[PDB]
PDB file of N, CA and C in Angstrom:
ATOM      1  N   UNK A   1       0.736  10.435  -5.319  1.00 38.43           N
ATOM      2  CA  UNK A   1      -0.146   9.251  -5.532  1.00 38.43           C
ATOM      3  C   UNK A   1      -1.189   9.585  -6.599  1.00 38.43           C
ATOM      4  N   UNK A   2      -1.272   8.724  -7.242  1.00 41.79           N
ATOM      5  CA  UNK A   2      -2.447   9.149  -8.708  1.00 41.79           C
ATOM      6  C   UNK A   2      -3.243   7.809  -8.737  1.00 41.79           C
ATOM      7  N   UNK A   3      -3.507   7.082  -9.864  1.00 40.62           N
ATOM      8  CA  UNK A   3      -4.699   5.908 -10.329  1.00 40.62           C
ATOM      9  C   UNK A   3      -3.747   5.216 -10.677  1.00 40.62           C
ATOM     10  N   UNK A   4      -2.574   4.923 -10.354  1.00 43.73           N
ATOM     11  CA  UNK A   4      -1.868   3.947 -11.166  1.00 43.73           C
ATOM     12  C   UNK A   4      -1.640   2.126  -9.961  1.00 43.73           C
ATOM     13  N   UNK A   5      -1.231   1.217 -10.439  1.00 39.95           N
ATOM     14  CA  UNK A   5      -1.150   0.076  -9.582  1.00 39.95           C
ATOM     15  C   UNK A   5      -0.216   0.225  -8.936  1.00 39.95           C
ATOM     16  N   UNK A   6       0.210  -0.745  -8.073  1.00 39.40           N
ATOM     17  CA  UNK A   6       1.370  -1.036  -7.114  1.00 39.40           C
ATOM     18  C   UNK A   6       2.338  -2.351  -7.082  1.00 39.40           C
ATOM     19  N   UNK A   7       3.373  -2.045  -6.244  1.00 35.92           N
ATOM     20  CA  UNK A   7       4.137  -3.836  -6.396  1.00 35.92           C
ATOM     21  C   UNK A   7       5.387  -3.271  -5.982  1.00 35.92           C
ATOM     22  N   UNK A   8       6.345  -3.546  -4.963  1.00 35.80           N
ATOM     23  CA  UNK A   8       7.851  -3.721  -5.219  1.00 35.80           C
ATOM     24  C   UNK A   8       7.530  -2.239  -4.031  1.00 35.80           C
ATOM     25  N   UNK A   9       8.871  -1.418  -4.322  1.00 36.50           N
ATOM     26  CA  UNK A   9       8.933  -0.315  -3.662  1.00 36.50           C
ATOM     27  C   UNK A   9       7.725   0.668  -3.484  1.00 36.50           C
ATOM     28  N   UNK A  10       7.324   0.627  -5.015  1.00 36.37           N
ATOM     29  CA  UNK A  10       5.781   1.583  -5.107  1.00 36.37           C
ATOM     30  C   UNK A  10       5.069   1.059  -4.275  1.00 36.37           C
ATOM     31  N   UNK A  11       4.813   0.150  -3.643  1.00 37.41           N
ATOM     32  CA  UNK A  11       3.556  -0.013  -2.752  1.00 37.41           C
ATOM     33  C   UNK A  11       4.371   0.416  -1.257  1.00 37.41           C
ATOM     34  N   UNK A  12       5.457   0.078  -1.277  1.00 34.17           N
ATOM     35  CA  UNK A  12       6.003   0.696   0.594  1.00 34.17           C
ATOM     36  C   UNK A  12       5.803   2.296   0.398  1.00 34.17           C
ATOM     37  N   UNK A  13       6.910   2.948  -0.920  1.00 35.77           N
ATOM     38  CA  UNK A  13       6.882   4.522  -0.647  1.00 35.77           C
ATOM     39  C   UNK A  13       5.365   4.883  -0.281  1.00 35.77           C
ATOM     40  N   UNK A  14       4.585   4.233  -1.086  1.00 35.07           N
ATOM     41  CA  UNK A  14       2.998   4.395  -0.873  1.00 35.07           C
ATOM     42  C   UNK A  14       2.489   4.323   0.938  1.00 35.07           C
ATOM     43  N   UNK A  15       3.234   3.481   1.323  1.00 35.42           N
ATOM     44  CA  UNK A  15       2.705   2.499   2.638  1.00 35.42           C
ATOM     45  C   UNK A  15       3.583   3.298   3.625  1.00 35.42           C
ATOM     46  N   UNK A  16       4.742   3.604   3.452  1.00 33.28           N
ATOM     47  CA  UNK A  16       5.859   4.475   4.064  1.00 33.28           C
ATOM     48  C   UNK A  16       5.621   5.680   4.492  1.00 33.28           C
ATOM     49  N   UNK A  17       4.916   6.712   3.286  1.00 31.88           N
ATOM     50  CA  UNK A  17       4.515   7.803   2.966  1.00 31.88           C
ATOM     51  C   UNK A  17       3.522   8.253   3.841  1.00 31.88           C
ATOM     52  N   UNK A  18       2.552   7.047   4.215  1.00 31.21           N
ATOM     53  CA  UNK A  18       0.844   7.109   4.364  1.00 31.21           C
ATOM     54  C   UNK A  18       0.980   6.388   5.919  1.00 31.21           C
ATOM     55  N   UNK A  19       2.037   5.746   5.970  1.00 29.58           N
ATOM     56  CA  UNK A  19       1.986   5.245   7.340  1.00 29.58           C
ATOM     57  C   UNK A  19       3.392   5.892   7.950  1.00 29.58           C
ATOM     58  N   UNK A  20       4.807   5.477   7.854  1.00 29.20           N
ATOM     59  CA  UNK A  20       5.736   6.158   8.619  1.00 29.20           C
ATOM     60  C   UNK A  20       5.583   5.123   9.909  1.00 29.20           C
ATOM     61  N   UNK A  21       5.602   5.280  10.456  1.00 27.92           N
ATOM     62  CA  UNK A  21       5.572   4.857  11.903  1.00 27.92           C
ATOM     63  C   UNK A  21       4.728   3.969  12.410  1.00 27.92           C
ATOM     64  N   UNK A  22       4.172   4.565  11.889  1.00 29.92           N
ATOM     65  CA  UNK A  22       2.387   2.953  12.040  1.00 29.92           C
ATOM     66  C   UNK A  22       3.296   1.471  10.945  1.00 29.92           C
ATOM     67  N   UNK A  23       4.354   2.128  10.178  1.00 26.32           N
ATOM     68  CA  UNK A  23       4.842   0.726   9.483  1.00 26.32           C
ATOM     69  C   UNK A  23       4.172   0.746   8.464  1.00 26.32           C
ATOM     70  N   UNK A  24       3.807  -0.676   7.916  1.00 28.75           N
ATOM     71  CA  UNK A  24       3.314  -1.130   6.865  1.00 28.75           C
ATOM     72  C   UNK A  24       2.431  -2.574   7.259  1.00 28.75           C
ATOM     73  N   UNK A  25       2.094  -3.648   7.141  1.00 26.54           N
ATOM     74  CA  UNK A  25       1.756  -4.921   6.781  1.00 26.54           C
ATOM     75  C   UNK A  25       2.148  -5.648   5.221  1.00 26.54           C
ATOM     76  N   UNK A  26       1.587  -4.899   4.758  1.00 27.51           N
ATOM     77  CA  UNK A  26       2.272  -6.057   3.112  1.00 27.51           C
ATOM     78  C   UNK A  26       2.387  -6.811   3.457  1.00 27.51           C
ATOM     79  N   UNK A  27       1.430  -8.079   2.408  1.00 25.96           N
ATOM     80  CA  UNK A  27       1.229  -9.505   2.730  1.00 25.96           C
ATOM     81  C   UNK A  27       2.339  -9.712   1.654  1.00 25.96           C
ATOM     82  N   UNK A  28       1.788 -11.043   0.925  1.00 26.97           N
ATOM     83  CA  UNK A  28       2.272 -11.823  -0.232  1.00 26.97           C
ATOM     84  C   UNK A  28       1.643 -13.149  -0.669  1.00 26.97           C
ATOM     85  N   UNK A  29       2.122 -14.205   0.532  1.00 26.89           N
ATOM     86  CA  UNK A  29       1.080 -15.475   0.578  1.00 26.89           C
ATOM     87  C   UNK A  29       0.169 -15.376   1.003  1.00 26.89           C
ATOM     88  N   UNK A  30      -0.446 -14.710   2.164  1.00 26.63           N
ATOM     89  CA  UNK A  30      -1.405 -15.142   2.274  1.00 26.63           C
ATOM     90  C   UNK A  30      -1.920 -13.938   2.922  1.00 26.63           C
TER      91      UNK A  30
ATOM     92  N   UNK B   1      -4.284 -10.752   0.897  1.00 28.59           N
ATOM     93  CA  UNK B   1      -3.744 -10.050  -0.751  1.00 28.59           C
ATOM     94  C   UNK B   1      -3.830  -8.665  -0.876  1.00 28.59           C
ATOM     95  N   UNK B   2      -3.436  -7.665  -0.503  1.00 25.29           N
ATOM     96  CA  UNK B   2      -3.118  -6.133  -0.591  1.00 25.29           C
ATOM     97  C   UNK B   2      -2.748  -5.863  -1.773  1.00 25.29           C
ATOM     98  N   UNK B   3      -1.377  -6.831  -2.852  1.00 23.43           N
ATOM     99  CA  UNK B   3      -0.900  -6.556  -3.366  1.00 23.43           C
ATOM    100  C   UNK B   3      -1.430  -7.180  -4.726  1.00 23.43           C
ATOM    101  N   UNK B   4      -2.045  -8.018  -4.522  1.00 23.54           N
ATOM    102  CA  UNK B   4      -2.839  -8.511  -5.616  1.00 23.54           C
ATOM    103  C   UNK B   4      -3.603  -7.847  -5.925  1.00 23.54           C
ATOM    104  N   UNK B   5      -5.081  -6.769  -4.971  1.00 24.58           N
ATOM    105  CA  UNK B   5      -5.501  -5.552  -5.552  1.00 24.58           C
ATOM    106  C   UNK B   5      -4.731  -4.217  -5.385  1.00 24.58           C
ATOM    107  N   UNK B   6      -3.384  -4.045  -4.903  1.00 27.55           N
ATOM    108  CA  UNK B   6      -2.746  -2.924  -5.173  1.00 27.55           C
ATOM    109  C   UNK B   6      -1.490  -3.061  -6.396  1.00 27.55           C
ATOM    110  N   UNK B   7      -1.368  -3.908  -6.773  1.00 27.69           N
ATOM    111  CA  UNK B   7      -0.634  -4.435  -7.958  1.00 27.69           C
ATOM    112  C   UNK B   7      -1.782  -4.868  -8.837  1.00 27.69           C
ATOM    113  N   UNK B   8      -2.775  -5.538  -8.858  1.00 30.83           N
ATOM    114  CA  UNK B   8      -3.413  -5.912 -10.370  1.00 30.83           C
ATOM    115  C   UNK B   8      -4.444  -4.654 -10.888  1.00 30.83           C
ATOM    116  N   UNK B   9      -4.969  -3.961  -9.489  1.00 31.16           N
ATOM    117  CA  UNK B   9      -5.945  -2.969  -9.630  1.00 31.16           C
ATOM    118  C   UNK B   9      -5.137  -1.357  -9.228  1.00 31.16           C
ATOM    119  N   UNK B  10      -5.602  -0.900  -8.433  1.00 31.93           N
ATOM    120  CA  UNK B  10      -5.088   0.735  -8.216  1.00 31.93           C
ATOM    121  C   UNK B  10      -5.366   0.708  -6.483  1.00 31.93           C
ATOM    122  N   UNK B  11      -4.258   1.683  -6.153  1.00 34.02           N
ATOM    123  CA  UNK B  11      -5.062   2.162  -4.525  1.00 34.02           C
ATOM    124  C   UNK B  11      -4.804   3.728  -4.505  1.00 34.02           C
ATOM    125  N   UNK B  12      -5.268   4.170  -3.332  1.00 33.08           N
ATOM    126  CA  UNK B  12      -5.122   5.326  -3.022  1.00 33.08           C
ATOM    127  C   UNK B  12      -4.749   5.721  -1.659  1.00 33.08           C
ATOM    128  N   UNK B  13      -4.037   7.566  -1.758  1.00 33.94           N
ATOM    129  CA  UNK B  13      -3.197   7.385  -0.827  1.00 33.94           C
ATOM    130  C   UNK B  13      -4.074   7.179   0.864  1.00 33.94           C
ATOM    131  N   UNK B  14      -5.160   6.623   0.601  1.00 33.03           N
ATOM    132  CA  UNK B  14      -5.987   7.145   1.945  1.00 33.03           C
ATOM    133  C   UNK B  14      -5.962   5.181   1.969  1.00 33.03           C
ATOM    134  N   UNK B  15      -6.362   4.652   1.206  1.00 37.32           N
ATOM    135  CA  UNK B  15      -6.662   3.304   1.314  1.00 37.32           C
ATOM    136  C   UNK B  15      -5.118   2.691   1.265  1.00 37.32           C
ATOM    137  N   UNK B  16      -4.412   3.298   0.967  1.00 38.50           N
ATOM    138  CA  UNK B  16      -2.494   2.789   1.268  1.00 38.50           C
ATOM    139  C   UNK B  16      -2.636   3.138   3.005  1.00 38.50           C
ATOM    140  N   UNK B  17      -2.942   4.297   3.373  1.00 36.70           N
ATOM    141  CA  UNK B  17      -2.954   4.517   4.643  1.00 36.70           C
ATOM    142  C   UNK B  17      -3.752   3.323   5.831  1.00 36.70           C
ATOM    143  N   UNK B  18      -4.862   2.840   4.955  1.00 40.61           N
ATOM    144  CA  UNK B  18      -5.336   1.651   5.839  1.00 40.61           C
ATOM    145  C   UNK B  18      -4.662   0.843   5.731  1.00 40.61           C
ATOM    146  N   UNK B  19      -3.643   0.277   5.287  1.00 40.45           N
ATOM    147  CA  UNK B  19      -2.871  -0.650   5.762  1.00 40.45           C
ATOM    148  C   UNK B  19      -1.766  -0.428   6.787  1.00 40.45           C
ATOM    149  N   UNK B  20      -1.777   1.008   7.276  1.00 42.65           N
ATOM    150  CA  UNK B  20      -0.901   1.139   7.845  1.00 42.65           C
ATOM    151  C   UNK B  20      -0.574   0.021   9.683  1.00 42.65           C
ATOM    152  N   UNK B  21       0.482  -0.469   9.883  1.00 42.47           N
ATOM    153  CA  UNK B  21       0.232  -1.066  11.503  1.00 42.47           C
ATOM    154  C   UNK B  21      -0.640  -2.207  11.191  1.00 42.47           C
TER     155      UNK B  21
END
């Protein structure tokens, strides 16, 4: 993980990585 | 919107972790 943005897979491996088991949330609409 | 500041801006791996659940 560095300073860069997110979107698409990069934000789950991010969310995946950092959570695992706790899941994720990721919105979209709202 | 998570992804609106993790897509338009930056996160980190501790503030990726608060979204976890």
């Amino acid at each position: 993980f560095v300073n860069q943005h997110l979107c698409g897979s990069d934000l789950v491996e991010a969310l995946y990585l950092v959570c695992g088991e706790r899941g994720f949330f990721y919105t979209k609409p709202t | 919107g998570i992804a609106e500041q993790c897509c338009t801006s930056i996160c980190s791996l501790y503030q990726l972790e608060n979204y976890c659940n």
